[PDB]
Amino acid sequence: NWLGGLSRAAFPKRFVFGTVTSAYQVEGMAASGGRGPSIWDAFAHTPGNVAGNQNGDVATDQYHRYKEDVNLMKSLNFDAYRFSISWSRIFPDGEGRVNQEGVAYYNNLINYLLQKGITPYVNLYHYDLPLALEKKYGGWLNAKMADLFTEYADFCFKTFGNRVKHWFTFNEPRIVALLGYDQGTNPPKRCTKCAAGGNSATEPYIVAHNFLLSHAAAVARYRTKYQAAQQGKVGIVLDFNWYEALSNSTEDQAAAQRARDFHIGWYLDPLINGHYPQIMQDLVKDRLPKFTPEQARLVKGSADYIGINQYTASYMKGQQLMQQTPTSYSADWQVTYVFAKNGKPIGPQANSNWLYIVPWGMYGCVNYIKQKYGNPTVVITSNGMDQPANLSRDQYLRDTTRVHFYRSYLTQLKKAIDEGANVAGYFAWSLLDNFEWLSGYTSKFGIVYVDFNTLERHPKASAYWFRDMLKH
Ligand SMILES: OC[C@H]1O[C@H](F)[C@H](O)[C@@H](O)[C@@H]1O
Numbered sequence: 001n002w003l004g005g006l007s008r009a010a011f012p013k014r015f016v017f018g019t020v021t022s023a024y025q026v027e028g029m030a031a032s033g034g035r036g037p038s039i040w041d042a043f044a045h046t047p048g049n050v051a052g053n054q055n056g057d058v059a060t061d062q063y064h065r066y067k068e069d070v071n072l073m074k075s076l077n078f079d080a081y082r083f084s085i086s087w088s089r090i091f092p093d094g095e096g097r098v099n100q101e102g103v104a105y106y107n108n109l110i111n112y113l114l115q116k117g118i119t120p121y122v123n124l125y126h127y128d129l130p131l132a133l134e135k136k137y138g139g140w141l142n143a144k145m146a147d148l149f150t151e152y153a154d155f156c157f158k159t160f161g162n163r164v165k166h167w168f169t170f171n172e173p174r175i176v177a178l179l180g181y182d183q184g185t186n187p188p189k190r191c192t193k194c195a196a197g198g199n200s201a202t203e204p205y206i207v208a209h210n211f212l213l214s215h216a217a218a219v220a221r222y223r224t225k226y227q228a229a230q231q232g233k234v235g236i237v238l239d240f241n242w243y244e245a246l247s248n249s250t251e252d253q254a255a256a257q258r259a260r261d262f263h264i265g266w267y268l269d270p271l272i273n274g275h276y277p278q279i280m281q282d283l284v285k286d287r288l289p290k291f292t293p294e295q296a297r298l299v300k301g302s303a304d305y306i307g308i309n310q311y312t313a314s315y316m317k318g319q320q321l322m323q324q325t326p327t328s329y330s331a332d333w334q335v336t337y338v339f340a341k342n343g344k345p346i347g348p349q350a351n352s353n354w355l356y357i358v359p360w361g362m363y364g365c366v367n368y369i370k371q372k373y374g375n376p377t378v379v380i381t382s383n384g385m386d387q388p389a390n391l392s393r394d395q396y397l398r399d400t401t402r403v404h405f406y407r408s409y410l411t412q413l414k415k416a417i418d419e420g421a422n423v424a425g426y427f428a429w430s431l432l433d434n435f436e437w438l439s440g441y442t443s444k445f446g447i448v449y450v451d452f453n454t455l456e457r458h459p460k461a462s463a464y465w466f467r468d469m470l471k472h
């Protein structure tokens with residue numbers, strides 16, 4: 001049967017199912033309703049930066065249509081909705097003056113979700129630093145971000161926290177560090193060779209440290225000022241793609257483990273254990289910032305749950321560890337990516353070239369976190385796959401590959417949960433086709449099709465799959 005034995009009965013009691021978007025990717029009204037620009041507004045308006053020179057000015061226009069989209073998610077039997085608050089929609093300059101019109105939007109959205117029985121899971125940050133903070137402070141290179149972020153978070157807790165009980169601070173700080181400061185392909189476009197300046201060997205580590213310190217500061221403020229009255233929770237969202245040793249050799253197994261540590265351990269070892277991974281300390285040395293004992297104690301235990309964004313898996317091949325002049329966070333891992341084993345690719349690709357369909361990577365990642373980090377509460381905060389540009393409406397709707405994707409990946413998640421993994425929820429990326437960053441509107445991740453000419457929504461087969469699987 002097309003559900004493949006899946007239903008709410010196949011998951012733990014009270015397990016949360018939801019869909020996910022982010023502010024810049026779906027809201028539109030980017031320069032309206034009082035919103036100030038983010039670093040993504042500037043980046044996307046520069047010719048050549050995004051496919052088709054497209055941008056999020058209008059996006060899906062969820063800003064005007066949010067009640068349609070909430071009605072849709074309820075009709076599809078979801079329990080929850082993960083979305084983000086745009087920092088610059090609340091504080092156009094990132095600090096100081098509050099944009100009351102922006103505040104009213106999120107109040108209206110939160111209130112409608114609750115009216116319709118959908119639980120809001122709210123991200124404070126999703127790639128969209130206010131441009132004013134980038135220019136005035138240097139963004140995530142500046143340790144002052146901890147204070148700036150805490151003040152923003154404090155405002156959101158005070159204003160929405162009587163209703164919002166499930167918060168996340170950040171989304172994928174690894175990708176900000178990697179693409180923003182190592183490879184220089186996302187804003188602020190910093191890297192050793194880059195026109196904007198930078199240093200691919202140092203800046204990614206500075207940025208990660210500042211995200212951890214900022215997360216910890218915001219959580220400390222929540223716990224000391226707001227938690228007694230509000231009785232909510234705050235976590236963080238981290239990307240994790242699986243790494244599998246190419247062979248059982250000592251060096252291939254070590255390579256795969258080095259990649260896990262440089263990928264997820266970079267954040268989880270501080271958040272769970274209060275220190276960076278030993279291998280990162282060993283290889284990165286004085287380029288890796290040191291937490292003071294006090295900072296380490298603030299960071300440790302500061303996530304009430306761990307959001308994992310999970311998509312794909314890679315084979316890893318090793319090498320003898322070498323003394324090397326530092327060049328980048330990427331080169332620091334000393335690993336070799338391989339995309340086939342025994343003459344077979346690890347999986348077929350979706351539309352995005354990085355996205356190999358490997359359902360067992362979901363099991364890999366979840367099992368790994370369970371066994372290594374004392375089985376922390378995990379929420380799968382994004383998982384999904386994309387269709388290419390230029391299909392007909394009917395072709396978008398008949399998304400049989402995405403149906404197969406969710407069935408297989410959720411079957412693997414079920415396997416990990418049935419073995420004891422403490423997973424509390426699962427969220428599909430995305431509710432809607434939307435603005436896919438460098439790919440603009442050429443990549444379609446939604447379970448609901450969005451016609452970008454007319455802005456009409458049409459549920460795809462995968463939406464109806466969820467509706468059938470999730471019926472109460
Ligand atoms: O690449 C697909 C998707 O991956 C992650 F979930 C990011 O948080 C999203 O912003 C992005 O659109």
Ligand SMILES: [Zn+2]
Pocket residue numbers: 061064
């Ligand atoms: Zn509109």
